[PDB]
């Protein structure tokens, strides 16, 4: 008599299928990666500074240096456990300090350089040589505070701030990622650009994007470092900047859910349209899935987890059209490339949203 038993609940079943599995994928079985022990933190910070204040021929492994500092901050065994828990069988290789050779430093000891697996030495000595030449040139020209030196403790966090700026747009295109990273770091990293006026933001951002694309476990390492930093009691200013950029990447890849919440908050009329009303059930199911996954549902597209895609709203064309129209009416949509299934609904929602934004009311 009543159509109350006609009910499927496909999305809950799909989530149950995916989560309730007793088998674990073993990927990257034959590969290896590099970590740096925490006891070398100082001598990585220096290198994190030498990539900054100098103009270098090639910035290939700046991202690997930022990840090495992350390793020192978390520790070797913690980093190994983080990589193992992300689903990778990659085996970490320990960074080793090594005497350069006949080169002798001011302190009378042999100059100890870094040996990072996968990053060849020659690049390291090239970066160090270029930084030393630049610093000698600047001292010759004029006579350098403590905060304009490579030994400054906030240089690794500035490198990781460029890394986090590219991390924010990991669900985006490489060109848009680089453009947004540079155009934000010209404002976000203004102090560091005053202290280090010749640090190359485009190449560092490109290196970080390449690293995040290839070594997908380093996304999980980055997220664990952000969680460790945000749970600290104290920090520097650059560390709080890094945590701000990191938390500005939370809902990455899922702006449709956010704009749907916005459209609900804006009381759009076309949400009550009959084509839309046929679809509120699966939309509520998607948001219920978000609630069920909990706080980790936001880092799905950053981690690049295959489970991301259950949160997609691509099967609600009326809802997506209304949401995109409401976002466009309020000026939110910007240069968003999301497809509009129903152009008529989009235009109507845009018109109503603009009419509401122009008008004002007292409640």
């Amino acid at each position: 008599m009543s159509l109350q038993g006609i009910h499927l609940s496909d999305l809950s079943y799909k989530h149950a299928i995916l989560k309730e599995s007793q088998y674990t994928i073993k990927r990257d079985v034959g590969t290896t990666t590099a970590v740096t022990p925490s006891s070398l933190q100082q001598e990585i910070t220096l290198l994190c500074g030498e990539i900054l204040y100098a103009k270098h021929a090639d910035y290939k492994y700046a991202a690997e240096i930022g990840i090495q500092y992350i390793s020192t901050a978390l520790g070797s065994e913690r980093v190994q456990q983080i990589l193992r828990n992300s689903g990778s069988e990659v085996q970490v290789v320990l960074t080793r300090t090594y005497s350069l050779g006949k080169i002798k430093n001011n302190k009378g000891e042999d100059l100890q350089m870094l040996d990072i697996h996968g990053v060849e030495k020659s690049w390291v000595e090239e970066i160090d040589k270029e930084a030393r030449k630049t610093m000698a040139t600047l001292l010759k020209e004029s006579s350098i505070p403590q905060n304009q030196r490579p030994s400054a403790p906030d240089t690794p966090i500035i490198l990781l701030c460029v890394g986090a700026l590219i991390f924010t747009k990991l669900a985006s295109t490489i060109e848009v990622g680089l453009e947004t990273t540079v155009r934000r770091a010209n404002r976000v990293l203004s102090d560091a650009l005053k202290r280090y006026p010749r640090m190359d933001i485009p190449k560092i951002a490109r290196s970080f994007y390449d690293l995040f694309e290839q070594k997908v476990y380093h996304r999980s390492l980055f997220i664990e470092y952000g969680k460790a930093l945000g749970s600290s009691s104290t920090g520097s200013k650059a560390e709080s900047l890094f945590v701000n950029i990191f938390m500005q990447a939370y809902g990455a890849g899922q702006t449709m859910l956010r704009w749907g919440v916005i459209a609900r908050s804006s009381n759009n009329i076309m949400l009550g349209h009959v084509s839309v009303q046929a679809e509120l059930k699966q939309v509520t199911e998607v948001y219920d899935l978000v609630r069920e996954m909990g706080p980790e549902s936001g880092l799905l597209h950053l981690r690049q987890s295959p489970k991301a895609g259950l949160l997609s709203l691509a099967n609600c064309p009326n809802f997506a059209s209304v949401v995109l129209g409401n976002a466009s009416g309020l000026g939110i949509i910007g240069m968003y490339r999301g497809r509009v299934p129903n152009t008529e609904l989009f235009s109507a929602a845009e018109s109503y949203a603009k009419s509401l934004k122009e008008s004002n009311k007292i409640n």
């Binding site: 430093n105 001011n106 040589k129 030393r132 610093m135 000698a136 030196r149 030994s151």
Partner: peptide, 7 residues
């Protein structure tokens, strides 16, 4: 003298 710098 390059490697003799303060750093």
């Amino acid at each position: 003298d390059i490697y003799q710098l303060i750093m």
